[PDB]
Design a protein around this nucleic acid. Structure first.
Ligand SMILES: [K+]
Ligand SMILES: [K+]
Ligand SMILES: [K+]
Ligand SMILES: [Mg+2]
Ligand SMILES: [Mg+2]
Ligand SMILES: [Mg+2]
Ligand SMILES: [Mg+2]
Ligand SMILES: [Mg+2]
Ligand SMILES: [Mg+2]
Ligand SMILES: [Mg+2]
Ligand SMILES: [Mg+2]
Ligand SMILES: [Mg+2]
Ligand SMILES: [Mg+2]
Ligand SMILES: [Mg+2]
Ligand SMILES: [Mg+2]
Ligand SMILES: [Mg+2]
Ligand SMILES: [Mg+2]
Ligand SMILES: [Mg+2]
Ligand SMILES: [Mg+2]
Ligand SMILES: [Mg+2]
Ligand SMILES: [Mg+2]
Ligand SMILES: [Mg+2]
Ligand SMILES: [Mg+2]
Ligand SMILES: [Mg+2]
Ligand SMILES: [Mg+2]
Ligand SMILES: [Mg+2]
Ligand SMILES: [Mg+2]
Ligand SMILES: [Mg+2]
Ligand SMILES: [Mg+2]
Ligand SMILES: [Mg+2]
Ligand SMILES: [Mg+2]
Ligand SMILES: [Mg+2]
Ligand SMILES: [Mg+2]
Ligand SMILES: [Mg+2]
Ligand SMILES: [Mg+2]
Ligand SMILES: [Mg+2]
Ligand SMILES: [Mg+2]
Ligand SMILES: [Mg+2]
Ligand SMILES: [Mg+2]
Ligand SMILES: [Mg+2]
Lengths: 63, 386, 129
RNA sequence: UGUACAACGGGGUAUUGUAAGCAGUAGAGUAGCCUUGGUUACGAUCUGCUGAGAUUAAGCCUUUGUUGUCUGAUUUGU
RNA sequence: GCAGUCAAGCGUUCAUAGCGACAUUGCUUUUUGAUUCUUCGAUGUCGGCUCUUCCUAUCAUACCGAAGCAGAAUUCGGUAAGCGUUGGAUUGUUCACCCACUAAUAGGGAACGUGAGCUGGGUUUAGACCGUCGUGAGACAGGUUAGUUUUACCCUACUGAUGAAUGUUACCGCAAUAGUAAUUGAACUUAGUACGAGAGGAACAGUUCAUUCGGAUAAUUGGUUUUUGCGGCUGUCUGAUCAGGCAUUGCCGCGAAGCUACCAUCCGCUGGAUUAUGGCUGAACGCCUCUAAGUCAGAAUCCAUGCUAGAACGCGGUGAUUUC
RNA sequence: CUCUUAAGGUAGCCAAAUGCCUCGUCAUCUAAUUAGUGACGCGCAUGAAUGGAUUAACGAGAUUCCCACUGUCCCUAUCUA
RNA sequence: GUGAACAGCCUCUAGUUGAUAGAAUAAUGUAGAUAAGGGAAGUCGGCAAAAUAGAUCCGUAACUUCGGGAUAAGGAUUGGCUCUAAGGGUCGACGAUCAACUU
RNA sequence: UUCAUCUAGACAGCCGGACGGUGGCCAUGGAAGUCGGAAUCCGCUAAGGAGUGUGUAACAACUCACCGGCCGAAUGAACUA
């Protein structure tokens, strides 16, 4: 098996966890859970969502 | 006049009455047919349902769309520490059925099983089996005489075994005692096996093996008094209905001038004895074996227990049986796993399953990490620790 | 020939038309191979053949019953690999009873189950999942 | 009178999403002062300490900690 | 309404493959009548919804017999009610009709089942309008619109739940009896094969799925939120801050647990005896004969296996049985 | 051409809240319509202040369709008092 | 106070804290809510519920008795903060002083 | 019950024959015993129908009425209740 990456939060998605969303333009989004799925549907920016990998990278957290 | 639109009846009339089971431990009402050429072996085992998890495995099913592909499957974990054999019961056959002729107990019984014979153990004098243990005074002549009777009689032999509930995380502390049929030849050697195993433990790996189809016998989760809508699955009445809609509209014709047994009625739901068959054993894991949750593909040294423990159960520290799918009964409930009563050869049975990965993420939420080391590696250093 | 997919398109559902036949939507009136149960609506899933009408579209395509094949569901369904997935919209393509498309092109992605079930849809498809 | 039980505490797990406070050559600008390049004041908000803080069994898991509890009533004889 | 008997004829020939005139014998009480026996100190008067059971005159599924059965399809018939028999447009409607799916969209009963189960669209109180009729008040199986659907806490029935009594108490069991369940389809392959001039075109075995149903279960996904758990927001109140109150759960996002969904997943057994029917041997009736004696196979049937309950007046084994 | 009345239903309108036959016929609306609408009219039994026909606006009046919306339903589940 | 507002919501003065209570949280209810995908397929009938909603700006059809229809239909915007501009009184083309809100 | 066959060999059973005149005449595109009408004959004869069926486009060919070889005593038909 291959561990996927959350399209919104960057969390590791193990087999069976979360959901997969195929957009109209055939782009694939993987969500580890309904929290990240709902934030994506609300169109929140992961760069503004303070607990996401993208936010932490942009804000130089941990490195 | 006729029903005017056909529909199947709601519910199964063969699972009646929908009453509470007389015991929290569901009785094994049928044991596998005895083949008296095989060695003496238990026909069943006692475990405690710990919880469920998920596994990934390559499907071996030629002709299937997912042949040689990876499937995610739900599995149930049953904490099964070795059972202690504490007695043997002999059963003679009669024109009125099987009848217990005599029971021979082990010389020493643990407090676990002794508690089973007591409603108030804390304030009792624990006199149980104190005079019986005196039958082993010098040579055990009475014990040998009773065993000789069982050999001379008792076309059916069952061993009395009790769980080691103290090895489970349960607070009950009172062991579960049950009869397990001894399959294998020569009732004489059945009795010899039982006597030689008095006061001794039998592990689940000596009863069950990987890829084996077994049956789970357990009392289902209780739900108390239930209306017809959820007890039987009847149609909800329209929103306009006066006097309530979670009902059956017509509970009978004018004649017979009686409510019939076949009509759905409100009553107790759950806590029923159920025997569900054909559950494939995915793992026969051992507590003394670390990397219980590891596979040949994962190699991560982790146990079967999810992060934070099995929710409402605890940690698996003993031998455990992982069966495919789900089984009757809730977590912490005593279940009986019995060998299949027939020889299933359908390519669903006889399929050799090799787990690639066992989920150990927390079941107390949307668990993201299989191991605390993985949580450490992903999260980096925190303020409290790490 | 396909595993069970959570039905998300009961009778009366209107899905977008993903082909270039000139129809804009398909209105489900039936599902081929659907069973019978009192009060239960026939419902379709990805890859199912339905009977549909064109509510808006070319007038020559409107006002008649025609076979269609569901290529996008938008109702979450579980694949055997444990993936719960769903599309952004419900979409289908006009076909004949033998599964041959009336159009010649697919707009948007197509479910893998539908592509595997219907070779003509797979041949005319672009991105599959 | 214990691999006892309980109430707290600790840890794990999980949820949310970065606490209070302090500080800042952050801040659109604005109003003073005089040594005229700063200083004083107001300022949504921003940044750092801070994936912090808070909650976490009430039907989560675990516990070498702390504190305590452990003979009250009724009835039953072949 | 349904089913027979006869057999002039139809069926190219051929009464009976399938039909069948002229006649004639019946059955049924899901038609409508006939009657007026019960009910007028009152049995709630249509239809639908819901739910259970029963019947078989069987639509489908099982196994078969016959054909004007080459195959495919179909038709007639037998055992068979085990199992299923649908989603919709119009109409109060029963009925009807059409669209569509399907293996099939069979017919019926149960006070024309079912209103202290619902609903109240219709009929069938009182309001009102129209048409015809009447001088008129008014009439109208003519049309139209509006029009209160009451009570169970009793007994029984049913569903679940306790429980005295057997020396006491405890554990493990047995199993009389009662119930019982699984269902149907598709694809691949067999096989473009058998068959057929060709057109067309199977079936058994095997495999993968699916439908309807049922029993569980909550690992995952989804739903649910008083976790009022965290955060955000409005108005106001606590001098400001911090931290809070109220807005009858203030609202919003997320939300663990629990519960739960063909909206999730798992599981749903194999032996015997039979029906129709096809046979064996074999007389009756030196032949023939599945039948008379005997006997083989055989259906979704039956009975068991298995599954549920465990007789609270069925039973067994076993432990301990009170110094005072 | 006849019989015939007080006059013989005119202008209009219609299967209309008035048409039995009738779910009239045609068209439209739908996959399908005893519904709706538009037409037609030998109209059981339409019709002129017993008012005819039509009408903007208005209507807790009757009705049909469409968009939005949804637990009315598929098919139920959960929560609070 | 918010707000157009005697609306709704919170508060001051004043008044009350009166409805039989305690414990649990089964079914079925009454009242209040939510719900994946579909969206009236339910039903006699969209009953019930949901959706919409204030204000500013834009835009607004048929038909009409010219008065309406009309908020037709259909769109956009809205918080906080720091500013900017315009709109006055009184007194002596300017100066002094004073002041409240609306855009 | 009635009528029949029968040790001068009943029925059933196995095997042989089942001719000639003659494809009898006619209707038909062709019909020879046999889709159909009429004629219902004889020679050989223990015995053979211008035909009991199968079969042929018509033939041809099997088949039966009829008579025989073998066995040896009861058998057949239509009726009545
Ligand atoms: K009466
Ligand atoms: K949940
Ligand atoms: K506040
Ligand atoms: Mg969730
Ligand atoms: Mg029926
Ligand atoms: Mg269920
Ligand atoms: Mg009501
Ligand atoms: Mg969990
Ligand atoms: Mg219905
Ligand atoms: Mg803690
Ligand atoms: Mg009465
Ligand atoms: Mg009555
Ligand atoms: Mg019958
Ligand atoms: Mg009735
Ligand atoms: Mg009643
Ligand atoms: Mg009533
Ligand atoms: Mg009624
Ligand atoms: Mg009414
Ligand atoms: Mg009236
Ligand atoms: Mg008059
Ligand atoms: Mg207050
Ligand atoms: Mg509050
Ligand atoms: Mg024979
Ligand atoms: Mg017999
Ligand atoms: Mg008993
Ligand atoms: Mg006229
Ligand atoms: Mg008219
Ligand atoms: Mg009209
Ligand atoms: Mg309609
Ligand atoms: Mg009039
Ligand atoms: Mg104001
Ligand atoms: Mg919804
Ligand atoms: Mg939604
Ligand atoms: Mg919609
Ligand atoms: Mg409808
Ligand atoms: Mg309907
Ligand atoms: Mg209607
Ligand atoms: Mg309403
Ligand atoms: Mg208008
Ligand atoms: Mg507008």
């Amino acid at each position: 098996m291959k561990v996927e990456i959350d399209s919104f939060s960057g969390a590791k998605i193990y087999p069976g966890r979360g959901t997969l969303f195929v957009r109209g333009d055939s782009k694939i989004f993987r969500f580890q859970n309904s929290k990240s799925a709902s934030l994506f549907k609300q169109r929140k920016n992961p760069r503004r969502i303070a607990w996401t990998v993208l936010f932490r990278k942009h804000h130089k957290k941990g490195i | 006049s006729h029903r005017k639109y056909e529909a199947p009846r709601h519910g199964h009339l063969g699972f009646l009455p929908r009453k509470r089971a007389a015991s929290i431990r569901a009785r094994v009402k049928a044991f596998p047919k005895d083949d008296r050429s095989k060695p003496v072996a238990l026909t069943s085992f006692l475990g405690y349902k710990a919880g469920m998890t998920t596994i990934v495995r390559d499907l071996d099913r030629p002709g299937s769309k997912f042949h040689k592909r990876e499937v995610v499957e739900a599995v149930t974990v049953v904490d099964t520490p070795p059972v202690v054999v504490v007695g043997v019961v002999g059963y003679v056959e009669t024109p009125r059925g099987l009848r217990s002729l005599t029971t021979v107990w082990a010389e020493h019984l643990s407090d676990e099983v002794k508690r089973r014979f007591y409603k108030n153990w804390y304030k009792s004098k624990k006199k149980a089996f104190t005079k019986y243990s005196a039958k082993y005074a010098q040579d055990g002549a009475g014990i040998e005489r009773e065993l000789a009777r069982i050999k001379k009689y008792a076309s059916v032999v069952r061993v009395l075994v009790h769980t080691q509930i103290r090895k489970t995380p349960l607070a009950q502390k009172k062991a579960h005692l049950a009869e397990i049929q001894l399959n294998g030849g020569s009732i004489s050697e059945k009795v010899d096996w039982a006597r030689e195993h008095f006061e001794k433990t039998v592990a689940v790996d000596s009863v069950f093996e990987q890829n084996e189809m077994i049956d789970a016998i357990a009392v289902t989760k209780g739900h108390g008094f239930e209306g017809v809508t959820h007890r039987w699955g009847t149609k909800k009445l329209p929103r306009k209905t006066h006097r309530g809609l979670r009902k059956v509209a017509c509970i009978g014709a004018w004649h017979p001038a009686h409510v019939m047994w076949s009509v759905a009625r409100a009553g107790q739901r759950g806590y029923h004895s159920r025997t569900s068959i054909n559950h494939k054993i995915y793992r026969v894991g051992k507590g003394d074996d670390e990397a219980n949750g590891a596979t040949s593909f994962d190699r991560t040294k982790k146990t079967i227990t999810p992060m934070g423990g099995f929710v409402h159960y605890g940690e698996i520290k003993n031998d455990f049986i992982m069966v495919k799918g789900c089984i009757p009964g809730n977590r912490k409930r005593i279940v009986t796993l019995r060998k299949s009563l027939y020889t299933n050869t359908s390519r669903k049975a006889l399929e050799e399953v090799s787990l690639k990965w066992i989920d150990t993420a927390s079941k107390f939420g949307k668990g993201r990490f299989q191991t605390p080391a993985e949580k450490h590696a992903f999260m980096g250093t925190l303020k409290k620790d790490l | 020939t396909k595993f069970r997919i959570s039905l998300g398109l009961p009778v009366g559902a209107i899905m977008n038309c993903a082909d270039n036949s000139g129809a804009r939507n398909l209105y489900i009136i039936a599902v081929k191979g659907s069973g019978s149960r009192l009060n239960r609506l026939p419902a379709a899933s990805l890859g199912d053949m339905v009977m549909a009408t064109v509510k808006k579209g070319k007038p020559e395509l409107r006002k008649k019953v025609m076979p269609a094949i569901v290529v996008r569901q938008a109702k979450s369904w579980r694949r055997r690999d444990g993936v719960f997935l769903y599309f952004e919209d419900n979409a289908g393509v006009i076909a004949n009873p033998k599964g041959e498309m009336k159009g010649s092109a697919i707009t948007g992605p197509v479910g893998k189950e539908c592509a595997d079930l219907w070779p003509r849809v797979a041949s005319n498809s672009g991105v599959v999942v």
